[PDB]
Amino acid sequence: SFRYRDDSTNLALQLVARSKTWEQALIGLGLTQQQLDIWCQLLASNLENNTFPTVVSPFSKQVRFLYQGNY
RNA sequence: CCAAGAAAAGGACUGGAAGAAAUCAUCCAAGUUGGGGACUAUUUUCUGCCGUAUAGGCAG
């Protein structure tokens, strides 16, 4: 992470959001426009799913209490 | 129905050798403790005979 435009961000977020200043510097450092056009898609895709676990993992903790009249 | 439930830290071991604390010295001067006073009371222990006897032994 780093501070940019007076907020908290990182490299993955600036490229997924299509932040032109970072893309212009990155192409200037030798990246082909076609390589960037593909990465913006794959990089974004990796942050679009699997945000909540499907099952409870067998080594996790579990504790139970009353809530709204039941456990 | 507890950041829930279960749990063997164990086995071994050489701190050693040697040494100089020393020399000197003025606590002094003065000083009012005093005045008054019940251990006996509702006590318990008297009266005699023998014996040279304030010795020693006895009845009531």
| Torsion A2-A24-A35-A38 (CA) sign | positive
Pull the structure tokens for residue A47: 């942050």
Cα–Cα distance, A18 to A60 (Å, whole number) = 38
**A71/B12 CA-to-C1' distance in Å:** 57
* Bridge partner list, A67: A70
Which resolution, in Å, applies to this structure? Answer: 3.5
- How far does CA A9 lie from the centroid of its chain? 10
**A11/B27 CA-to-C1' distance in Å:** 94
Specify the nucleotide whose C1' lies closest to residue A62 (CA).
Answer: B4
**A15/B49 CA-to-C1' distance in Å:** 153
